[PDB]
Amino acid sequence: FETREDIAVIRNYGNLLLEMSAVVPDGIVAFFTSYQYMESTVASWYEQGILENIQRNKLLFIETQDGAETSVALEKYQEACENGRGAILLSVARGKVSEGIDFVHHYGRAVIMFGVPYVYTQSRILKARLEYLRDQFQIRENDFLTFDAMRHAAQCVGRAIRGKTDYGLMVFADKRFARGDKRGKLPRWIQEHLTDANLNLTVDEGVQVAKYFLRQMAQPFHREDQLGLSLLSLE
Amino acid sequence: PGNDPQEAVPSAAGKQVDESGTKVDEYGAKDYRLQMPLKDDHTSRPLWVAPDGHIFLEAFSPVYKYAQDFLVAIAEPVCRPTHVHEYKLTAYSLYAAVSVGLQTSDITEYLRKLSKTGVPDGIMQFIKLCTVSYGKVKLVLKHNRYFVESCHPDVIQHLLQDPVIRECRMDLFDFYEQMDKDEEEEEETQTVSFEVKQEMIEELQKRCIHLEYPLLAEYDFRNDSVNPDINIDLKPTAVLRPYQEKSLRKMFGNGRARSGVIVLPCGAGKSLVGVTAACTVRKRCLVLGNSAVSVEQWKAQFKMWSTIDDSQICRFTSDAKDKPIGCSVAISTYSMLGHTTKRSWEAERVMEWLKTQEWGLMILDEVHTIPAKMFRRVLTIVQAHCKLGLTATLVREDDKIVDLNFLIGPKLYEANWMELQNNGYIAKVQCAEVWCPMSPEFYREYVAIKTKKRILLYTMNPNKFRACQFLIKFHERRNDKIIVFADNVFALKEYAIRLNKPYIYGPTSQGERMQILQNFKHNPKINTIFISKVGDTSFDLPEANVLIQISSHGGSRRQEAQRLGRVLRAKKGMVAEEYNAFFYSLVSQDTQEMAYSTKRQRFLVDQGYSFKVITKLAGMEEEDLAFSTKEEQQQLLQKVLAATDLDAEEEV
Amino acid sequence: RWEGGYERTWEILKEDESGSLKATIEDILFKAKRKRVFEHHGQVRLGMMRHLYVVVDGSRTMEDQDLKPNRLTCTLKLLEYFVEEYFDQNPISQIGIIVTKSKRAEKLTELSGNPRKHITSLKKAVDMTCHGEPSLYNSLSIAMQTLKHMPGHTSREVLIIFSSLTTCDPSNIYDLIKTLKAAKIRVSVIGLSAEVRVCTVLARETGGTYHVILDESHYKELLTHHVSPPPASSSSECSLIRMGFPQHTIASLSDQDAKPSFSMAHLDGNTEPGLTLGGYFCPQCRAKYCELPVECKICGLTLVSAPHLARSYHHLFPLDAFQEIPLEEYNGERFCYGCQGELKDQHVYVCAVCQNVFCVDCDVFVHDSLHCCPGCIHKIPAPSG
Numbered sequence A: 001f002e003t004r005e006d007i008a009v010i011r012n013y014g015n016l017l018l019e020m021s022a023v024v025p026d027g028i029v030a031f032f033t034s035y036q037y038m039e040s041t042v043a044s045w046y047e048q049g050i051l052e053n054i055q056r057n058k059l060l061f062i063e064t065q066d067g068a069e070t071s072v073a074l075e076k077y078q079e080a081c082e083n084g085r086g087a088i089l090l091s092v093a094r095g096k097v098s099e100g101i102d103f104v105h106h107y108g109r110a111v112i113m114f115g116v117p118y119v120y121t122q123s124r125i126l127k128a129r130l131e132y133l134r135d136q137f138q139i140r141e142n143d144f145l146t147f148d149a150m151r152h153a154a155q156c157v158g159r160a161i162r163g164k165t166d167y168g169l170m171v172f173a174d175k176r177f178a179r180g181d182k183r184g185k186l187p188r189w190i191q192e193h194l195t196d197a198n199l200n201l202t203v204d205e206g207v208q209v210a211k212y213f214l215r216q217m218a219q220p221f222h223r224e225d226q227l228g229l230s231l232l233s234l235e
Numbered sequence B: 001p002g003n004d005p006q007e008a009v010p011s012a013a014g015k016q017v018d019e020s021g022t023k024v025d026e027y028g029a030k031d032y033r034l035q036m037p038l039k040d041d042h043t044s045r046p047l048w049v050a051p052d053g054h055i056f057l058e059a060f061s062p063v064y065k066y067a068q069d070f071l072v073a074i075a076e077p078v079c080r081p082t083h084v085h086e087y088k089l090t091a092y093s094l095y096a097a098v099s100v101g102l103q104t105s106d107i108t109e110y111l112r113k114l115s116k117t118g119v120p121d122g123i124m125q126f127i128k129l130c131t132v133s134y135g136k137v138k139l140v141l142k143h144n145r146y147f148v149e150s151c152h153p154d155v156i157q158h159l160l161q162d163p164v165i166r167e168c169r170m171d172l173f174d175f176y177e178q179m180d181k182d183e184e185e186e187e188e189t190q191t192v193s194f195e196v197k198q199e200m201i202e203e204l205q206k207r208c209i210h211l212e213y214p215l216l217a218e219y220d221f222r223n224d225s226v227n228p229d230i231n232i233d234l235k236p237t238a239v240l241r242p243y244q245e246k247s248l249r250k251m252f253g254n255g256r257a258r259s260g261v262i263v264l265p266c267g268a269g270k271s272l273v274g275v276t277a278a279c280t281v282r283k284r285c286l287v288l289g290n291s292a293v294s295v296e297q298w299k300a301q302f303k304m305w306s307t308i309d310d311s312q313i314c315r316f317t318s319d320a321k322d323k324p325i326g327c328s329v330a331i332s333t334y335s336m337l338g339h340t341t342k343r344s345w346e347a348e349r350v351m352e353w354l355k356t357q358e359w360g361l362m363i364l365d366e367v368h369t370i371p372a373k374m375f376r377r378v379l380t381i382v383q384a385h386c387k388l389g390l391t392a393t394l395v396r397e398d399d400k401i402v403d404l405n406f407l408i409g410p411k412l413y414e415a416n417w418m419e420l421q422n423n424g425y426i427a428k429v430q431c432a433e434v435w436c437p438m439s440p441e442f443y444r445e446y447v448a449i450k451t452k453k454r455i456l457l458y459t460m461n462p463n464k465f466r467a468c469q470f471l472i473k474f475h476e477r478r479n480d481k482i483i484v485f486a487d488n489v490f491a492l493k494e495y496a497i498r499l500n501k502p503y504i505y506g507p508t509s510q511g512e513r514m515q516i517l518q519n520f521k522h523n524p525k526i527n528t529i530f531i532s533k534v535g536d537t538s539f540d541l542p543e544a545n546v547l548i549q550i551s552s553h554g555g556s557r558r559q560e561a562q563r564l565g566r567v568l569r570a571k572k573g574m575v576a577e578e579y580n581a582f583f584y585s586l587v588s589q590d591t592q593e594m595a596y597s598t599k600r601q602r603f604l605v606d607q608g609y610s611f612k613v614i615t616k617l618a619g620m621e622e623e624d625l626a627f628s629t630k631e632e633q634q635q636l637l638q639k640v641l642a643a644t645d646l647d648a649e650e651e652v
Numbered sequence C: 001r002w003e004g005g006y007e008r009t010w011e012i013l014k015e016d017e018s019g020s021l022k023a024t025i026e027d028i029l030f031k032a033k034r035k036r037v038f039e040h041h042g043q044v045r046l047g048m049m050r051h052l053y054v055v056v057d058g059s060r061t062m063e064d065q066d067l068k069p070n071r072l073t074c075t076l077k078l079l080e081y082f083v084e085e086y087f088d089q090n091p092i093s094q095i096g097i098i099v100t101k102s103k104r105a106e107k108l109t110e111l112s113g114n115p116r117k118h119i120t121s122l123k124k125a126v127d128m129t130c131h132g133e134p135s136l137y138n139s140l141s142i143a144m145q146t147l148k149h150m151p152g153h154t155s156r157e158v159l160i161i162f163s164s165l166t167t168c169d170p171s172n173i174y175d176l177i178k179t180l181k182a183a184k185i186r187v188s189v190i191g192l193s194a195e196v197r198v199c200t201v202l203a204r205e206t207g208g209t210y211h212v213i214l215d216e217s218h219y220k221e222l223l224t225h226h227v228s229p230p231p232a233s234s235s236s237e238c239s240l241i242r243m244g245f246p247q248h249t250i251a252s253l254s255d256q257d258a259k260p261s262f263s264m265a266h267l268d269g270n271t272e273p274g275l276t277l278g279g280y281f282c283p284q285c286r287a288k289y290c291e292l293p294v295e296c297k298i299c300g301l302t303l304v305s306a307p308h309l310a311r312s313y314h315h316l317f318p319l320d321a322f323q324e325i326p327l328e329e330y331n332g333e334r335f336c337y338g339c340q341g342e343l344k345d346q347h348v349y350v351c352a353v354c355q356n357v358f359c360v361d362c363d364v365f366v367h368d369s370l371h372c373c374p375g376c377i378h379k380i381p382a383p384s385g
């Protein structure tokens, strides 16, 4: 039931966000699907009571269809995190706000998935592109129409860590995860980390996860995979 | 008939339960609960396995062993008393057909592995796998697909018996629609699911499904795909709390097809999770209220935490007739009628809109209130596919003949008092059975007269009033809500005459009773109120902090204990970890009231709460006590000498 | 699915070495769970006469339970212990109890060393609503202007109890770096169960040490880590002068009972609103009032009382360490050089110099209560020169 077919779906994206907002400090850049989706995203948010604690916890950075006003909150977000404010930015995956940044542990260290990040928009640009790869490999309808979402997902999502201690809370609010998210996530990244024993993680339960995550991960850092001389190890 | 799953086993094999001589399987335990504790840890301690009755919980050096199993071992236990860091008893019942993510032999291994081969009597053995795990999915083709199990070795008996009884058998706009049907996978492994025998044969089948040695789990696949309509649900900012967040997570840890029955303590989020089940599930639901008393309440928080109200409201008892034509989500009441044209078109609508309800949901408050004769009409009238048992009571009516999992399936969740009363919003009651030294000029008469005026004698006591007068001003000083429950009116009336307070009785006008609620539950100037037998039962759920009781004569332990369990709310935003809800009872010494309280405090320690008997006050003549002269009490006494039996009877 | 999967968590952890000896190694791992960070000290340089500033976040974060029924209950209760154990270790100092509540800052108890005043303040701080949001800028404003009038011969450190929330304050607190970096005031925060990067940048731009609260035991650790007067930044001071040595007075010296009470609004001293009979005497005011080993308000110098406070750190620096061996050199008759016993949990504790054999209960009693090896005595003082 699509981004405008029911708002009963949308009754708890705020709930899964505000608690993400309540727990996670230090700036978050999340990814919507499109601009009218984004316009649909905040559509119930004003008139029905949503922001009533969301603006009270952090603040919000709307990204505009026009790139001029889109670059504005940006000027704010690099600043509004580095002062006494968390100031979660709100953005669109497929929109061109998702490149050229390389978020640092300074600002931007968490990403929330919102929906299957596929195209959903342009009609019949599919079918000839579809049938030609069906003229190339013939079972591809199911196949790349997963990965096109996936190739944009961690393109967007897997951004906020630069070095290798920079943190990242890349949670997955998604209904399509069973094979698709697993196929699309890196083989280094499905293996040790993705769903070790955490799949159907209700947010209220998943609250304490990031709590357990960060609190431990914030302290005791000195030594993390220190290499000196050459000692084979052979991977 | 045809209503017999495995009843609770132990009935025999034991003689003078002081088994100082035999304890033979306990000697297997007592070998290793005693051979093991040598070097500073026990590595033993079999939960004190007792063959008959029940077994215990160690829970005094649980560390990790039995403190993990402070919860987890309790699946088929129920932990009926609660304690301090000591032992903890339980009972045993039907609760393996709830524990169906595990084998009865798998627990039996850990039943041994907890017990350090503290071996069963066998009594549990001959009652372990009496009902093999088996589900009943209701899949997309309008009735059911004949699901068996993850495990295959059960159709081998079944298909060699059941069919010889009764057989079984644009592009992008639609691309994702089969991607959902792509997600219709193997049902965790192999499913082994068969085809509907024509929808009118399952009733004929269910009675024979249990007939060998299996038992069936009715489900509710109403969320992914559903062929009939879906109402407009909308959860308008209804922030809730992790006691009931766990609840639906127990109702849904699997996919979108499993029914549920969850126990809460009293005053908990009762009208929340069902309203949460009203909206999340996307069904067209039904409530079955106990009385119209319930019906007004349960829609009201539904009117609160759901904006589903645009004459979209279906309350159906005591000439309510609200939205018959068009049923979306309804509240009903248990049509206990069986009468000759009781409600001509009205109960016909209750019959016929049950048929329009299809299945909906069976929201059922507190079915300990339901008799087994009405449990006939539970299944006979209502033939739904998903139920909801909202029953704080675990065991009721002393009826160990008919159990309840045959009615409602598994009994999913019960919430711990400790993790609500110590870690949670539920306040801590101080229960007080307070007895008083009476004046003896109530009692020589009492023992002279073996006639029910004797009941009214200790009742109309200023020694009771001196306690009654006391805690009013003693808790006026904390400026917090207090409520007193008497037994009958005309004694209580003089309390509302002498130290005159807000009060009600039987025939009082409800619109002014509501003003009294407005004068009580809103106005902070008067935190004092009197109630009668009706107000707890038929008009109001009071919402207070401190309760005083006078009535203790009838043996309905819980029915009285659920009155206090509903009313007593949090007193203040108290920083301290103390008790803040308060119960008081007024007990006549040397009386039926003295005798009843002994069994009553026995029932108090049967569940176990913060309880204290006080007898003296915190300085009696500190307050200007009325009836300080016994001549004034003699003035009351001659009213009692003028009194009849009519002041001494309740609503029944 | 999950009804099995809820109990796939339980089943293995319940299970262990079976047959015989069950639920045994599960207890061994619990002992193997123990033995966390010991000391890791050994420092020099600075730490003397601190001037601490309790800063308390009063916010809606307190309403979460997370360790206690309130996060203040986690906080406030052990602060009294932290007060007392401070005044135990460091009496040469004083502490500014300043409370942030509703986006302002209330200096609740002044910078002082009187424990009862500080503790009853915490006992007054029990029934705090903690309404409103944290504002550190108001807290640093008090912290500046108060410590601005303190000498540069003062240790300048700030202890902030922050509930990890949004640092809700304007007015360029990022520019308060150069304010306070120049002002040579140290600022130390520890985060309540989370982290604030700006505050983490603040402390790393400070030299104050930042941490995150893990647990109630862990909460105590960092308190205990900040009990000790830390080696703050170089070029603070060297000296601090006119340390007034007082006199006790018995008021029975020559003229027996010539004064009914030694506080009658004219006597040199008699500072606080209460009657007294003469117990004390300062050099410079010649101030006679209720005894106090701190300082005064008229002579305005430091009422030093040497056996108390010129003794406390006076052995808190010069420590050495022991070593541990599991071996059996059986020194004594399988005894201890201290308490004289034996259990042999392979922790034969040998001194670095005098090399004497001790137990945990002799090592702890040194390293928490005695703070030195007395085996060095009989061994230092006999050839000492």
Ligand SMILES: [Zn+2]
Pocket: C283, C284, C285, C286, C298, C299, C300
């Ligand atoms: Zn002076």
Ligand SMILES: [Zn+2]
Pocket: C336, C337, C338, C339, C340, C357, C358, C359, C360, C361, C362, C363
């Ligand atoms: Zn020793």
Ligand SMILES: [Zn+2]
Pocket: C351, C354, C355, C356, C373, C374, C375, C376, C377
């Ligand atoms: Zn030594």
